[PDB]
């Protein structure tokens, strides 16, 4: 079965996927089970690495329309000799850039991929220490932020060698707010970040103990113990959240940071593993997790918004949760737009993704897409991705999950 | 292998063993997942299918290996030998029909699966008799607004040239007419079937909420038209608890969702006509796609009457009007005492249902893509619930529309 077809049930457009033939790794599904809603369903040896590097180099020389050329054959022989004599190899700058852009292009869960070719790639493979990691990360944050006109970027630190000298960013994102578990069980700040917050304090961080404390960077170079650094506050662009109609919404005291920069994933290119590779874009409004904050000793933001809206909160069928959720998302978009900080709403983002997906089917022969993650977390059926059938499969280069470094790190 | 499913809000982990019993394919492979794709016998093949079903029936009544289990297997085997098919016992039909619902991975309403009223219509021979059985189904299931789940099962497929079919997609739906300009009077989802009914002799009233006639096919014959008696069709005028102008939109909907175009498979037997009904979850009610005027959706018109800024999508006017429409649907059914469930309560019930099924059955096949409601997904408890999807039998299946296969006479 060389071709697979997907249908859009609103428009009746049918697209034909051949790209899936290049899929490399297992999905977790079988002919008898689907694991599509499952969150996640020793270094490479010499013999394991030869074919993975050849596949990548072949793909690279095809993309630049030099497949089979003298340069292609010479590059292949060079890589083969490096693996034979050193058990690994080094990517050229061009291949690194190509590989990072294509890991984004291949990210089946990412709705923002129409932008994939504009990624700014910062080569930090000469970095040797956590201070140098901090320098690279500050420059990335400053460049990507661009005074609110956000630019997508990735910074790539040295690849894994024996697995005992890994570079890692222990933060899950470069910018996130601390959370503090109180003795009485309540949470101050962002509840998602309580474990990592406790690690930072344990490493020596003196917490301000506020609602929106930007966490320090915890940076690990060359397998050494990680080191704490404070991001300069002038580099952290933030948006106060207010509402175009509800005067009281600003009184909730909410703000969010402008730059989503995920820093705990692994970038895999040609069998090489870049365990420190923070990448950033701009937000879709629904992602901003200000909803889980506590306004007082007992109430969510969602509950507190509904209470200030004078909604009936005794029955679920009044849809007070739905009403409040819409208004919170209105406030997020209004505030970012008012402050001229790049943000995209879920209608625009999904409409762009469908245009992206069609272009990729036409020009590339397919587009791996994970419906469970592409459909936004609200108003699903009124966005164009809901009635769009998708095929999910794993192409390389790719971004991958990796274990939390505190679970594996051997402390010096 | 046992497979774990995790809820990422509660951290509850359930262990799935039931998927090891599934025998039908899902469409996915090791290299490609097709979870968002909508649609991914002979004498010689029938008895293994029948044996598998008879086995699980007698296992379910804790009489596996019993004398009656063996005799029934011997009876079914002889009957396939001599007649190329077999007939289910009344008890087996009821078990089979209930477990087809129990196994419907896309249905969020399955906490109710064992309370299903099963109507045996296997003695039916004509479209007039189908009409009678269907009228009795509608009347019983409607129950003056205290809706009750029911299925009516017509005779099984024989050689494939004598199928019983309900040509309607639901027992009760509104007509939809192609307007001279291009807009739509009535339900846009039903324009094609409406044209079929008009071609078949139906005289259309050409309003916004014309209940379609039943188009009924018995024994492979040409289908016949019938008008459901209007007093059997319970309807709810849609109004809003805050917006007094909502009732001026003139919208209404019918109370009884009764899907009639799917195929029920039990023990290798195929029941091509088997309309089943329950009650609505409010988000299902497709009143959103109606046209108020010559150019505007109900969604666009509701946003207008709400005085929202409709020039930019980031004002979220679509999301705001959608919530208000769904508030009005629920308020209206509740005000008229017609059974309805909101998507918060329904998904909460389904999580409890999963817990029950993992405890007593070792798993629950679930299709996340279809279980998560079409609005406010992540603030319902199913969003963060991992699910395993697999195909068990008895099951409800899709089948082609009869007007693509039927040869007229
Ligand atoms: C430019 C604007 C971008 C937007 C609007 C965007 C949007 C999104 C959204 C909404 C998600 C799902 C979020 C969730 O479920 O919580 C996502 C996931 C993801 N994005 Fe993008 N994204 C952008 C840029 C990027 C870039 C620059 C990269 C990498 C170079 C990237 C890689 C990924 C990956 C790997 C995932 C999946 C993470 C996982 O599997 O856990 N994105 N994106
Ligand atoms: C009792 C109240 C019930 C509720 C609230 C309910 C709810 C739902 C919903 C919301 C869907 C998906 C809707 C959509 O995607 O448009 C669905 C699918 C389905 N339901 Fe239920 N349901 C109920 C009863 C039943 C009964 C009694 C049966 C059969 C005996 C049944 C069989 C199915 C099947 C087979 C599907 C999937 C159809 C397909 O795969 O295309 N449901 N249900
Ligand atoms: C905790 C389970 C959810 O996992 C997730 C969920 C989302 C993303 C993610 C990654 C990159 C993004 C970029 C560059 C821009 C943007 N607007 N959004 C992003 C969202 C990562 C992970 C895993 N680190
Ligand atoms: C270790 C991180 C814990 O946080 C987590 C953990 C898990 C999920 C989660 C789980 C299931 C999802 C499904 C089925 C679809 C989707 N589109 N997204 C999901 C996101 C989010 C968060 C963030 N609260
Ligand atoms: C048109 C594409 C989607 O297909 C669908 C979508 C939904 C259902 C369905 C079936 C039975 C239901 C019952 C008994 C109650 C209820 N409240 N809802 C139901 C919804 C069927 C089909 C197959 N036609
Ligand atoms: C011939 C029937 C035409 O109507 C149709 C046809 C198709 C779908 C449809 C398509 C894809 C869906 C996905 C990926 C998830 C989900 N949860 N639901 C879906 C429903 C609905 C309708 C109802 N308008
Ligand atoms: Zn799958």
Swiss-Prot record, chain A:
It comes from the Eukaryota. Keywords: Calmodulin-binding, Cell membrane, Cell projection, FAD, Flavoprotein, FMN, Heme, Iron, Membrane, Metal-binding, NADP, Oxidoreductase, Phosphoprotein, Synapse, Ubl conjugation. One of its GO terms (biological process) is response to hypoxia. (6R)-L-erythro-5,6,7,8-tetrahydrobiopterin binds at residues 37, 372-373, 386. One of its GO terms (molecular function) is nitric-oxide synthase activity. It comes from Homo sapiens (Human). This is Nitric oxide synthase 1. It is found in: Cell membrane, Sarcolemma; Cell projection, Dendritic spine. The chain holds residues 303 to 722 of 1434 of the full protein.
UniProtKB/Swiss-Prot annotation, chain B:
Signal peptide: none annotated. GO terms for biological process: arginine catabolic process; calcium ion transport; cell redox homeostasis; cellular response to growth factor stimulus; establishment of localization in cell; multicellular organismal response to stress; myoblast fusion; negative regulation of blood pressure. (6R)-L-erythro-5,6,7,8-tetrahydrobiopterin binds at residues 36, 369-370, 383. Keywords: Calmodulin-binding, Cell membrane, Cell projection, FAD, Flavoprotein, FMN, Heme, Iron, Membrane, Metal-binding, NADP, Oxidoreductase, Phosphoprotein, Synapse, Ubl conjugation. L-arginine binds at residues 170, 279-280, 284. GO terms for cellular component: calyx of Held; caveola; cell periphery; cytoplasm; cytoskeleton; cytosol; dendritic spine; membrane raft. Isoform 1 is ubiquitously expressed: detected in skeletal muscle and brain, also in testis, lung and kidney, and at low levels in heart, adrenal gland and retina. Not detected in the platelets. Isoform 3 is expressed only in testis. Isoform 4 is detected in testis, skeletal muscle, lung, and kidney, at low levels in the brain, but not in the heart and adrenal gland. It comes from the Eukaryota. Ubiquitinated; mediated by STUB1/CHIP in the presence of Hsp70 and Hsp40 (in vitro). GO terms for molecular function: arginine binding; cadmium ion binding; calcium channel regulator activity; calcium-dependent protein binding; calmodulin binding; flavin adenine dinucleotide binding; FMN binding; heme binding. Produces nitric oxide (NO) which is a messenger molecule with diverse functions throughout the body. In the brain and peripheral nervous system, NO displays many properties of a neurotransmitter. Probably has nitrosylase activity and mediates cysteine S-nitrosylation of cytoplasmic target proteins such SRR. Belongs to the NOS family. The PDZ domain participates in protein-protein interaction, and is responsible for targeting nNos to synaptic membranes. Mediates interaction with VAC14. This is Nitric oxide synthase 1. It comes from Homo sapiens (Human). The gene is NOS1. The chain holds residues 304 to 722 of 1434 of the full protein.
């Amino acid at each position: 079965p060389r071709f697979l077809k997907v249908k859009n049930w609103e428009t009746e457009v049918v697209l034909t996927d051949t790209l899936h033939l290049k899929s490399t790794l297992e999905t977790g599904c079988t002919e008898y089970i689907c694991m599509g809603s499952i969150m996640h369903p020793d270094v490479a040896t010499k013999d394991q690495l030869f074919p993975l590097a050849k596949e990548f180099i072949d793909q690279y020389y095809s993309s630049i329309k030099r497949f089979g050329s003298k340069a292609h054959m010479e590059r292949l022989e060079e890589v083969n000799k490096e693996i034979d004599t050193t058990s690994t190899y080094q990517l050229k700058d061009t291949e690194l850039i190509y590989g990072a852009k294509h890991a984004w292009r291949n990210a089946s869960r990412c709705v923002g991929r129409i932008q994939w070719s504009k990624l700014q790639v910062f080569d930090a493979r000469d970095c040797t220490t956590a201070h140098g990691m901090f320098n690279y990360i500050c420059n990335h944050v400053k460049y990507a932020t661009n005074k609110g006109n956000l630019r997508s970027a990735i910074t790539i630190f040295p690849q894994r060698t024996d697995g005992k000298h890994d570079f890692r960013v222990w933060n899950s994102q470069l910018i996130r707010y601390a959370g503090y578990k109180q003795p009485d069980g309540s949470t101050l700040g962002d509840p998602a970040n309580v474990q990592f917050t406790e690690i930072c304090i344990q490493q020596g961080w003196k917490p301000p103990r506020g609602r929106f404390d930007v966490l320090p960077l915890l940076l690990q170079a060359n397998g050494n113990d990680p080191e704490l650094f404070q991001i300069p506050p002038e580099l952290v662009l933030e948006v106060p959240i207010r509402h175009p109609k509800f005067e009281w919404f600003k009184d909730l005291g909410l703000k969010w940071y402008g730059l989503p920069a995920v820093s705990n994933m692994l970038l895999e290119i040609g069998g090489l593993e870049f365990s420190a590779c923070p990448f950033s874009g701009w937000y879709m409004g629904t992602e901003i997790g200000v909803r889980d904050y506590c306004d007082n000793s007992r109430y969510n933001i969602l509950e507190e918004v509904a209470k200030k809206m004078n909604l009936d909160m005794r029955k679920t069928s009044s849809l007070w949760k739905d009403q409040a959720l819409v208004e919170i998302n209105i406030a997020v978009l209004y505030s970012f737009q008012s402050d001229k900080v790049t943000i995209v709403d879920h209608h625009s983002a999904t409409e762009s993704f469908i245009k992206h997906m069609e272009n990729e089917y036409r020009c590339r022969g397919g587009c791996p897409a994970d419906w469970v993650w592409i459909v936004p977390p609200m108003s699903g059926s009124i966005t164009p991705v809901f009635h769009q059938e998708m095929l999910n499969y794993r192409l390389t280069p790719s971004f991958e999950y990796q274990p939390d470094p505190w679970n594996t790190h051997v402390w010096k």
